[PDB]
């Protein structure tokens, strides 16, 4: 066997392992991680009018008869398999419209227990769950349940765009469907051959600079907890207060969306005594390496580890440090932040091994509660996954911000979180209305209470 240059991925139709996102690979290959909600199962249930049951079911058959990028299924061998073949629909219709109000309560309760115990066909690879609820007064609810790699922020934006076109009967400009995950991994493992030198070096630079992963009190050991409860709190705070701090941040010379979310998320986790702490922000970076990738959403969701320098100080030091280090991480968009954390778990300096994962997306559709849903109004779901231990999603509707924070009820006492939220609530009010809070230490806001001053 002669010494030669390592080839690109010729596994174009052959089942290939998952992406270098070790978080997603850990979740899929090792299911039943309890603290992380047992698995990465989320439900998207859109209340509204899209189309009829037989039209929806036939639409699935037609799309699966084609080969869209997100036709991927997770096989428990640790390989993801993309089939050009339409597997099956599995669309079960719920009669609430024809039936009584009892039938409503019967189905919603039954599908809740069912969802939590649903034995997916992940056993062989190809799994999906479609629950199509027919509501009274011509209304519908498309309740889709999935735990596997076929769902993602990138895959969801891709799906809904092609979906609402198909629901309207609109023929869109035909996208180059000849690109799957194998096309991405083809180029990325090819350039990994030299570039992994840099990828390891600069991620290791941060993997030396960041301390033990956030020590937050767990009521008991996750080893003994099999059964967890997902407690997600929703909050719609006045558009003026939020966007006043967003305007105050943009005015100060830092990112509006990032500033709001990082203030809540950093202070919450910092209470464990972590002056230095790696926060996980969901960034959107779509590499247009090939022309077709520049149109289809495969690469897009790239997560980032921004280590805070301190908390309890003036906004000047806090905001400038996070903004500076984010510019260094904007050079580290070449790969995922997972490699940094993968180097941390190699150093074995992880008491918990998971950071706090947040996204702040304002400037959505001022009609729908979520912009990524045009056909129906989706209810707030579950984001407690083996990779995400504390969830902070931010949404927008009518200019007003819909906060969504999912957390393990069995470990996190509400009072603890609401003491640190009390800090954030007084902080955003004081700082958005008054520049006085700029020259005040943030320590006064979280560590000091009883009105504090």
Coordinates of C-alpha atoms in Angstrom, one line a residue:
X1 CA 0.0 0.0 0.0
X2 CA 2.0 3.1 -1.3
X3 CA 2.2 6.4 0.6
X4 CA -0.3 8.6 -1.3
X5 CA -2.7 11.6 -0.7
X6 CA -5.8 10.7 1.2
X7 CA -8.9 10.6 -1.1
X8 CA -12.2 12.6 -0.8
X9 CA -15.4 10.8 0.4
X10 CA -16.5 8.3 -2.4
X11 CA -19.3 7.2 0.1
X12 CA -21.8 9.3 -2.0
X13 CA -24.6 6.5 -1.7
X14 CA -22.8 4.4 1.0
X15 CA -24.0 4.9 4.7
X16 CA -21.5 7.3 6.3
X17 CA -21.0 8.3 10.1
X18 CA -22.4 11.6 11.5
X19 CA -21.0 15.2 11.2
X20 CA -17.9 16.3 13.5
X21 CA -20.6 17.6 15.9
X22 CA -19.6 15.2 18.7
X23 CA -22.6 16.6 20.7
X24 CA -25.1 15.2 18.0
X25 CA -23.0 11.9 17.7
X26 CA -23.0 11.4 21.5
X27 CA -26.8 11.9 21.6
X28 CA -27.5 9.5 18.7
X29 CA -25.0 6.7 19.6
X30 CA -25.7 6.9 23.4
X31 CA -29.5 7.3 23.9
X32 CA -31.1 7.4 27.3
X33 CA -29.0 10.2 28.8
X34 CA -31.5 11.3 31.4
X35 CA -30.5 14.8 32.4
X36 CA -30.7 15.6 28.7
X37 CA -34.5 14.7 28.6
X38 CA -33.6 11.0 27.9
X39 CA -33.1 12.0 24.1
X40 CA -33.2 14.8 21.6
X41 CA -37.0 14.6 21.0
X42 CA -38.9 17.8 20.1
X43 CA -42.5 18.3 18.8
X44 CA -43.6 20.9 16.4
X45 CA -47.5 21.3 16.5
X46 CA -48.8 24.1 14.2
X47 CA -52.4 25.2 14.9
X48 CA -54.0 26.7 11.8
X49 CA -55.1 25.8 8.2
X50 CA -52.6 24.3 5.7
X51 CA -54.5 21.6 3.6
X52 CA -56.4 18.3 3.9
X53 CA -55.2 15.0 5.4
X54 CA -55.0 13.1 2.0
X55 CA -53.3 16.1 0.3
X56 CA -50.7 16.3 3.2
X57 CA -50.0 12.5 3.2
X58 CA -49.6 12.4 -0.7
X59 CA -47.3 15.5 -0.5
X60 CA -45.0 13.6 1.9
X61 CA -45.0 10.6 -0.6
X62 CA -44.1 13.0 -3.5
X63 CA -41.2 14.9 -1.6
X64 CA -39.7 11.5 -0.4
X65 CA -40.1 10.2 -4.1
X66 CA -37.5 13.0 -4.8
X67 CA -34.2 13.3 -2.9
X68 CA -34.1 16.6 -0.8
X69 CA -30.9 17.1 1.4
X70 CA -32.9 16.4 4.6
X71 CA -33.9 12.8 3.5
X72 CA -31.5 11.6 6.2
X73 CA -32.3 8.8 8.8
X74 CA -30.2 7.8 11.8
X75 CA -29.1 4.1 12.0
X76 CA -27.9 3.0 15.5
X77 CA -24.6 1.7 14.1
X78 CA -23.4 5.4 14.3
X79 CA -24.0 5.9 10.5
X80 CA -26.6 8.3 9.0
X81 CA -28.3 6.8 5.9
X82 CA -29.9 9.1 3.2
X83 CA -32.4 7.0 1.1
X84 CA -33.7 8.2 -2.4
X85 CA -36.7 5.9 -1.7
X86 CA -40.1 7.0 -0.2
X87 CA -40.2 4.9 3.0
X88 CA -43.8 5.6 4.3
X89 CA -46.1 8.4 5.4
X90 CA -47.5 7.2 8.8
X91 CA -50.0 10.2 9.0
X92 CA -52.6 9.3 11.7
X93 CA -55.7 11.7 11.6
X94 CA -57.4 12.7 14.9
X95 CA -61.2 13.5 14.7
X96 CA -62.0 16.5 17.0
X97 CA -64.0 18.4 14.3
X98 CA -66.5 15.6 13.7
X99 CA -66.3 14.4 17.3
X100 CA -67.0 15.9 20.8
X101 CA -64.9 18.1 23.1
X102 CA -64.2 14.9 25.1
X103 CA -62.4 13.5 22.0
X104 CA -60.1 16.5 22.1
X105 CA -59.1 15.9 25.7
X106 CA -58.7 12.2 25.0
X107 CA -56.3 12.6 22.0
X108 CA -54.1 15.4 23.5
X109 CA -53.6 13.5 26.7
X110 CA -53.0 10.1 24.9
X111 CA -50.4 11.6 22.5
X112 CA -48.5 13.3 25.4
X113 CA -47.9 10.0 27.2
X114 CA -47.4 8.3 23.8
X115 CA -44.8 10.9 22.7
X116 CA -42.8 10.4 26.0
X117 CA -42.7 6.5 25.5
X118 CA -42.9 6.4 21.6
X119 CA -40.7 3.5 20.3
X120 CA -39.2 5.2 17.2
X121 CA -38.1 3.1 14.1
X122 CA -34.5 4.5 14.8
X123 CA -34.0 0.7 15.7
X124 CA -33.5 0.1 11.9
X125 CA -32.7 3.7 10.8
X126 CA -35.7 5.4 9.2
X127 CA -38.0 7.0 11.8
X128 CA -40.7 9.7 11.8
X129 CA -44.0 10.4 13.6
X130 CA -46.9 12.3 12.1
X131 CA -50.0 13.2 14.2
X132 CA -52.4 15.3 12.1
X133 CA -55.1 16.7 14.4
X134 CA -58.4 17.8 12.7
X135 CA -59.8 20.7 15.0
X136 CA -63.5 22.0 14.8
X137 CA -64.3 25.1 12.7
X138 CA -62.3 23.8 9.6
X139 CA -59.0 24.1 11.7
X140 CA -56.0 21.7 11.9
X141 CA -52.9 21.0 14.0
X142 CA -49.8 19.3 12.3
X143 CA -48.1 17.7 15.3
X144 CA -44.8 16.1 14.1
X145 CA -42.6 14.2 16.7
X146 CA -38.9 13.3 15.9
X147 CA -35.8 12.2 17.7
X148 CA -32.8 12.0 15.2
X149 CA -30.6 14.0 12.8
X150 CA -33.4 14.7 10.3
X151 CA -34.3 17.9 12.4
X152 CA -32.2 21.0 12.9
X153 CA -32.6 24.9 12.7
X154 CA -31.1 24.6 9.1
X155 CA -33.3 21.6 8.2
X156 CA -36.4 23.4 9.6
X157 CA -35.8 26.6 7.6
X158 CA -35.2 24.5 4.5
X159 CA -38.4 22.4 5.1
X160 CA -40.9 25.3 5.9
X161 CA -39.9 27.3 2.8
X162 CA -40.4 24.4 0.4
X163 CA -43.5 23.4 2.5
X164 CA -45.6 26.7 2.3
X165 CA -44.8 26.8 -1.5
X166 CA -46.1 23.2 -1.9
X167 CA -49.2 24.0 0.3
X168 CA -50.1 27.1 -2.0
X169 CA -49.4 24.9 -5.1
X170 CA -46.5 27.2 -6.0
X171 CA -43.8 25.7 -8.2
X172 CA -40.5 27.2 -6.9
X173 CA -37.1 27.5 -8.8
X174 CA -35.8 23.9 -8.7
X175 CA -33.0 23.6 -6.2
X176 CA -29.9 21.4 -6.9
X177 CA -31.0 18.3 -4.9
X178 CA -27.7 16.5 -5.7
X179 CA -26.1 17.7 -2.4
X180 CA -26.5 15.6 0.8
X181 CA -24.4 15.5 4.0
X182 CA -21.9 13.2 2.1
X183 CA -21.2 16.2 -0.3
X184 CA -20.3 18.4 2.8
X185 CA -18.2 15.7 4.5
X186 CA -16.5 15.1 1.1
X187 CA -14.9 18.6 1.1
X188 CA -14.6 19.1 4.9
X189 CA -12.7 15.9 5.6
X190 CA -10.6 16.6 2.5
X191 CA -9.5 20.1 3.8
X192 CA -9.4 18.6 7.3
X193 CA -6.2 16.7 6.2
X194 CA -4.0 20.0 6.4
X195 CA -6.4 22.5 8.2
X196 CA -7.0 20.2 11.3
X197 CA -3.5 21.5 12.4
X198 CA -5.0 25.0 12.7
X199 CA -8.4 23.7 13.9
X200 CA -6.9 21.9 16.9
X201 CA -4.2 24.6 17.6
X202 CA -6.5 27.7 18.0
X203 CA -9.4 25.7 19.6
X204 CA -6.8 24.3 22.1
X205 CA -5.6 27.9 22.8
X206 CA -9.1 28.5 24.2
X207 CA -9.2 24.9 25.6
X208 CA -6.3 26.0 27.8
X209 CA -7.8 29.5 28.7
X210 CA -11.4 28.3 29.9
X211 CA -11.9 27.0 33.5
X212 CA -14.0 23.9 34.8
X213 CA -17.5 23.7 33.0
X214 CA -20.2 25.6 35.1
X215 CA -20.8 24.1 38.5
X216 CA -24.5 24.5 39.2
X217 CA -26.2 22.6 42.1
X218 CA -28.0 19.4 41.0
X219 CA -30.7 18.3 43.6
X220 CA -29.6 14.7 43.1
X221 CA -27.2 12.7 40.8
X222 CA -28.4 12.3 37.1
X223 CA -27.2 8.7 37.4
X224 CA -30.1 7.9 39.9
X225 CA -32.7 10.1 38.0
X226 CA -34.2 8.0 35.2
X227 CA -37.4 10.0 34.8
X228 CA -37.0 13.8 34.3
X229 CA -39.7 16.5 33.8
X230 CA -39.4 19.3 31.2
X231 CA -40.4 22.7 32.8
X232 CA -40.4 25.4 30.1
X233 CA -41.5 28.9 31.2
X234 CA -42.8 31.4 28.5
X235 CA -42.6 35.2 29.0
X236 CA -44.0 38.0 26.8
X237 CA -42.4 41.3 28.1
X238 CA -43.3 44.8 26.7
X239 CA -41.6 45.5 23.3
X240 CA -40.4 48.9 24.6
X241 CA -38.3 47.5 27.6
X242 CA -36.6 44.8 25.5
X243 CA -35.9 46.9 22.4
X244 CA -34.8 49.9 24.6
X245 CA -32.0 47.6 26.0
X246 CA -31.5 46.3 22.4
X247 CA -31.2 50.0 21.2
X248 CA -29.0 50.8 24.3
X249 CA -26.7 47.9 23.3
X250 CA -26.6 48.8 19.6
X251 CA -25.9 52.4 20.7
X252 CA -23.2 51.2 23.1
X253 CA -21.4 49.5 20.2
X254 CA -22.2 45.8 20.9
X255 CA -24.8 43.3 19.3
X256 CA -28.5 44.1 20.4
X257 CA -29.7 40.5 20.3
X258 CA -26.5 38.9 21.7
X259 CA -26.3 41.5 24.6
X260 CA -29.9 40.7 26.0
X261 CA -29.5 36.9 25.9
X262 CA -25.9 36.8 27.2
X263 CA -26.8 39.1 30.2
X264 CA -29.5 36.5 31.3
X265 CA -27.6 33.3 30.4
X266 CA -24.1 34.3 31.8
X267 CA -25.4 35.7 35.2
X268 CA -27.7 32.6 35.7
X269 CA -24.7 30.1 35.3
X270 CA -22.1 32.5 36.8
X271 CA -23.8 32.2 40.3
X272 CA -22.0 28.8 40.7
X273 CA -18.8 31.0 41.2
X274 CA -17.6 31.0 37.6
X275 CA -16.2 34.5 36.8
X276 CA -14.8 32.8 33.6
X277 CA -17.5 30.7 31.8
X278 CA -17.9 29.3 28.2
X279 CA -21.4 30.3 27.0
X280 CA -22.9 28.5 23.9
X281 CA -24.5 30.8 21.3
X282 CA -26.3 29.3 18.3
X283 CA -24.8 31.3 15.3
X284 CA -26.0 31.1 11.7
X285 CA -23.1 30.8 9.1
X286 CA -24.0 29.2 5.8
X287 CA -20.7 28.4 3.9
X288 CA -21.4 28.9 0.1
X289 CA -18.3 26.7 -0.7
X290 CA -20.3 25.2 -3.7
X291 CA -23.0 27.2 -5.6
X292 CA -25.8 24.7 -4.7
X293 CA -25.0 25.0 -0.9
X294 CA -25.5 28.8 -1.3
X295 CA -29.2 28.1 -2.0
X296 CA -30.0 24.9 0.1
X297 CA -29.8 24.8 4.0
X298 CA -27.4 22.0 5.1
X299 CA -24.5 23.9 6.6
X300 CA -26.0 26.9 8.6
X301 CA -26.3 25.9 12.3
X302 CA -22.7 26.5 13.8
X303 CA -22.5 26.9 17.6
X304 CA -19.9 29.2 19.3
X305 CA -18.2 29.1 22.8
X306 CA -17.8 32.7 24.1
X307 CA -16.0 32.7 27.5
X308 CA -17.1 35.7 29.7
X309 CA -14.1 37.5 31.4
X310 CA -16.1 38.5 34.5
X311 CA -19.5 39.4 35.9
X312 CA -20.4 41.8 38.7
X313 CA -18.5 44.7 37.0
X314 CA -19.4 47.8 35.0
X315 CA -21.0 47.2 31.5
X316 CA -17.9 48.7 29.9
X317 CA -15.6 45.8 30.8
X318 CA -18.3 43.1 30.4
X319 CA -19.6 44.1 26.9
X320 CA -16.2 45.0 25.5
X321 CA -14.6 41.7 26.6
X322 CA -17.5 39.5 25.2
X323 CA -17.5 41.6 21.9
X324 CA -13.7 41.3 21.5
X325 CA -13.5 37.6 22.2
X326 CA -16.6 37.1 19.8
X327 CA -14.5 38.7 17.0
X328 CA -11.8 36.0 17.7
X329 CA -14.6 33.4 17.6
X330 CA -15.7 35.0 14.3
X331 CA -12.3 33.7 13.0
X332 CA -13.2 30.3 14.6
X333 CA -16.3 30.1 12.4
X334 CA -14.0 27.8 10.2
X335 CA -15.2 24.8 12.3
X336 CA -17.8 24.2 15.1
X337 CA -17.3 25.2 18.8
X338 CA -17.9 21.4 19.6
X339 CA -14.1 20.8 18.8
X340 CA -13.2 23.3 21.6
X341 CA -15.5 21.4 24.1
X342 CA -14.2 18.1 22.7
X343 CA -10.7 19.3 23.6
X344 CA -12.0 20.3 27.1
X345 CA -13.4 16.7 27.8
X346 CA -10.0 15.3 26.6
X347 CA -8.3 17.6 29.2
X348 CA -11.0 16.1 31.5
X349 CA -11.6 19.5 33.2
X350 CA -15.4 19.1 33.1
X351 CA -17.5 18.7 36.3
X352 CA -20.7 18.8 34.1
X353 CA -19.3 19.0 30.5
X354 CA -22.2 21.0 29.1
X355 CA -22.6 24.9 28.8
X356 CA -25.8 27.0 28.7
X357 CA -27.2 27.1 25.1
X358 CA -29.1 30.3 24.0
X359 CA -30.2 31.9 20.8
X360 CA -31.7 35.5 20.5
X361 CA -33.5 36.0 17.2
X362 CA -35.6 39.3 17.1
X363 CA -37.0 40.9 13.9
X364 CA -39.3 38.0 13.0
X365 CA -42.7 38.2 11.3
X366 CA -45.0 40.6 13.2
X367 CA -48.0 38.3 12.7
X368 CA -46.9 34.7 13.5
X369 CA -45.6 33.8 17.0
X370 CA -42.7 32.1 15.2
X371 CA -41.4 33.3 11.7
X372 CA -40.3 29.8 10.7
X373 CA -44.0 28.7 10.9
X374 CA -46.1 30.6 8.1
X375 CA -48.9 27.9 7.8
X376 CA -49.7 27.5 11.6
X377 CA -49.1 28.9 15.1
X378 CA -46.7 26.4 16.8
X379 CA -46.9 25.7 20.6
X380 CA -43.7 26.1 22.7
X381 CA -42.0 22.6 23.0
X382 CA -39.1 20.8 24.6
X383 CA -35.4 21.6 24.0
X384 CA -33.8 19.6 26.9
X385 CA -31.4 17.4 25.0
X386 CA -28.1 15.4 26.0
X387 CA -26.1 18.4 24.6
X388 CA -28.3 21.3 25.9
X389 CA -28.8 21.2 29.8
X390 CA -30.2 24.7 30.1
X391 CA -32.3 26.1 27.1
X392 CA -32.8 29.8 26.4
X393 CA -34.8 30.4 23.1
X394 CA -35.9 34.0 22.3
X395 CA -38.8 34.7 19.8
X396 CA -40.6 37.8 18.4
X397 CA -44.3 38.5 17.6
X398 CA -46.0 41.9 17.1
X399 CA -42.6 43.5 18.1
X400 CA -42.9 41.8 21.5
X401 CA -40.4 39.2 22.6
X402 CA -41.6 35.6 23.5
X403 CA -39.0 34.1 25.9
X404 CA -38.8 30.3 26.2
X405 CA -36.5 28.7 28.9
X406 CA -36.7 24.8 29.2
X407 CA -35.0 23.2 32.3
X408 CA -34.9 19.9 34.2
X409 CA -37.6 20.3 36.9
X410 CA -36.1 17.3 38.8
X411 CA -32.8 19.2 39.4
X412 CA -33.4 23.0 39.0
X413 CA -35.5 24.6 41.8
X414 CA -37.7 27.5 40.3
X415 CA -36.9 29.9 43.2
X416 CA -33.1 29.7 42.4
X417 CA -33.7 30.6 38.7
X418 CA -36.2 33.4 39.7
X419 CA -33.7 35.0 42.1
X420 CA -31.2 35.3 39.1
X421 CA -34.1 36.3 36.8
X422 CA -35.0 39.1 39.5
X423 CA -31.4 40.3 38.9
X424 CA -31.9 40.3 35.0
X425 CA -35.4 42.0 35.3
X426 CA -34.1 44.9 37.4
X427 CA -30.9 45.0 35.3
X428 CA -32.7 45.5 31.9
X429 CA -35.1 48.1 33.4
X430 CA -32.2 50.1 35.0
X431 CA -29.8 50.0 32.0
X432 CA -32.4 50.5 29.2
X433 CA -33.9 53.6 30.8
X434 CA -30.8 54.9 32.7
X435 CA -27.1 55.1 31.8
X436 CA -26.6 55.2 35.6
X437 CA -26.5 51.3 35.6
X438 CA -23.4 51.5 33.2
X439 CA -21.3 53.0 36.1
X440 CA -22.9 50.6 38.6
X441 CA -21.3 47.1 39.3
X442 CA -23.7 44.3 38.2
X443 CA -22.8 42.6 41.5
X444 CA -25.3 45.0 43.1
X445 CA -28.0 43.5 40.9
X446 CA -27.6 39.6 41.4
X447 CA -25.6 39.1 44.6
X448 CA -27.3 42.0 46.4
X449 CA -31.1 42.0 46.9
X450 CA -33.6 43.5 49.5
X451 CA -34.2 46.3 46.9
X452 CA -30.3 46.9 46.9
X453 CA -29.8 50.7 47.3

